[PDB]
């Protein structure tokens, strides 16, 4: 089997992309941000507490003749951002794309963070991060992408991230027309739960290449791309203006620049971030400091390849016996 669905930036900036989920018989509709650095499946519901929602749609698992309460079990994250959420689980079925997975976990939310409510356009996360890092408490639940895996014609997803356009994820088959060149693929640790991988360095602008071996994850559910402090700096000096804010938390630059692009290695492959790509824009509506997107990593105690540097590529997850990761330039 195989599945293709498109996904969509939910702002004019990419702060995040949804892409539609089936849930339950008849199907309930949810458009869930697809988030390789986390393995929770979850959904604002009937369940949650009605102060907590604010126009996202929400699954009714009453309405469902599929939906089973899954006895017993919670489930409880907290994200890198301090976003939060928790609740009961169900099994139902989840389709995406055409995918169907039947008896999959939908954690229900009870309760989210206010940064889950404030966003309207995002009615759920769907975790594809490896499902040792799933939260449902007493027995952990597989991803959506690990029940998925042995029905597909190939253990694979892809990421296809646009750039203030749509973009695809595909499961189960690698698209040849989606990418330009070959795909380098690059080693996988699954030791803390993410798809970690080194990359071999970068670049700046037009700059010499830069050989230094920089772990981290290949996260679509964060927006920007988090490095170390030397590797940020590097980038910032190349702008007119740009500074570290304290007060704003991280990297501004003046809204009148042109940015720099910024590359990145895999093995001997090169990724090019546009400079326009890097541009999060003002800080806050009508100002001339803009906000940038690339920002130091120093404290999360991970580096993240979030969108910002996804959106540059075409991504493969490979979840072969071995894991693997893709790049290809598109
Ligand atoms: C700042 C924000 C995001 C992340 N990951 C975000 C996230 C939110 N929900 C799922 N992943 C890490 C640092």
Redesign the pocket.
Same mark, same amino acid.
Request: net charge negative.
């Given at each position: 089997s195989t599945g293709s669905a498109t996904t969509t930036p939910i702002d004019s900036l990419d702060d995040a992309y949804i892409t539609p989920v089936q849930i339950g018989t008849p199907a309930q509709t949810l458009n869930l /941000?697809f /988030?390789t &650095? =986390?393995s929770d499946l979850w959904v604002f519901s009937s369940e949650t507490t009605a102060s907590e929602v604010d126009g996202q749609t929400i699954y009714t698992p009453s309405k469902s003749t599929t939906a089973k309460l899954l006895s017993g079990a919670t489930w409880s994250i907290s #994200? &890198? /951002?301090g =976003?939060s959420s928790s609740g009961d689980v169900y099994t139902d079925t989840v389709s995406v794309g055409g995918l169907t997975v039947t008896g999959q976990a939908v954690e229900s939310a009870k309760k989210v963070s206010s940064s889950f409510t404030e966003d309207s356009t995002i009615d759920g +996360?769907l975790g594809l991060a490896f499902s040792t890092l799933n939260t449902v408490s007493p027995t952990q639940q597989k991803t959506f992408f690990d029940n998925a895996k042995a029905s597909l014609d190939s253990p694979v997803f892809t990421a296809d991230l646009g750039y203030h356009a749509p973009g695809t994820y595909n499961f189960g088959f690698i698209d040849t027309t989606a990418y330009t060149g070959s795909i380098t693929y690059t080693a996988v640790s699954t030791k803390q739960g993410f798809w970690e991988w080194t990359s071999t360095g970068y670049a700046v602008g037009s700059g010499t290449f830069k050989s230094t071996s920089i772990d981290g994850i290949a /996260?679509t &559910? @964060? @927006? +920007?791309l #988090?490095l170390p402090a030397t590797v940020v700096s590097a980038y910032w000096a190349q702008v007119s203006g740009a500074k570290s804010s304290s007060s704003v938390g991280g990297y501004v630059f003046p809204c009148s620049a042109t940015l720099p692009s910024f590359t990145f290695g895999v093995g001997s492959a090169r990724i090019v971030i546009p400079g326009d790509y890097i541009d999060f824009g003002p800080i806050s509506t009508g100002s001339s400091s803009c906000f940038g997107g690339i920002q130091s990593s120093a404290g !999360?105690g991970i580096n !993240?390849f &979030?969108d910002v540097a996804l959106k540059a590529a075409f991504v493969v997850f490979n979840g072969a016996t071995t894991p693997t990761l893709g790049f290809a330039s598109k």
């Amino acid at each position: 089997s195989t599945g293709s669905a498109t996904t969509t930036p939910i702002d004019s900036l990419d702060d995040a992309y949804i892409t539609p989920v089936q849930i339950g018989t008849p199907a309930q509709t949810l458009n869930l /941000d697809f /988030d390789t &650095g =986390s393995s929770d499946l979850w959904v604002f519901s009937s369940e949650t507490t009605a102060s907590e929602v604010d126009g996202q749609t929400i699954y009714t698992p009453s309405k469902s003749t599929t939906a089973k309460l899954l006895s017993g079990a919670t489930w409880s994250i907290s #994200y &890198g /951002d301090g =976003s939060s959420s928790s609740g009961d689980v169900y099994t139902d079925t989840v389709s995406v794309g055409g995918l169907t997975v039947t008896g999959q976990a939908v954690e229900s939310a009870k309760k989210v963070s206010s940064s889950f409510t404030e966003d309207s356009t995002i009615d759920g +996360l769907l975790g594809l991060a490896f499902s040792t890092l799933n939260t449902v408490s007493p027995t952990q639940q597989k991803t959506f992408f690990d029940n998925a895996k042995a029905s597909l014609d190939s253990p694979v997803f892809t990421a296809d991230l646009g750039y203030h356009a749509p973009g695809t994820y595909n499961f189960g088959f690698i698209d040849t027309t989606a990418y330009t060149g070959s795909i380098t693929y690059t080693a996988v640790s699954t030791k803390q739960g993410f798809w970690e991988w080194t990359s071999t360095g970068y670049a700046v602008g037009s700059g010499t290449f830069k050989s230094t071996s920089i772990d981290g994850i290949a /996260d679509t &559910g @964060t @927006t +920007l791309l #988090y490095l170390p402090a030397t590797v940020v700096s590097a980038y910032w000096a190349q702008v007119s203006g740009a500074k570290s804010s304290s007060s704003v938390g991280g990297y501004v630059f003046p809204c009148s620049a042109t940015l720099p692009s910024f590359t990145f290695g895999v093995g001997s492959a090169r990724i090019v971030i546009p400079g326009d790509y890097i541009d999060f824009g003002p800080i806050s509506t009508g100002s001339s400091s803009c906000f940038g997107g690339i920002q130091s990593s120093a404290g !999360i105690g991970i580096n !993240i390849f &979030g969108d910002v540097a996804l959106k540059a590529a075409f991504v493969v997850f490979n979840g072969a016996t071995t894991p693997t990761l893709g790049f290809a330039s598109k």
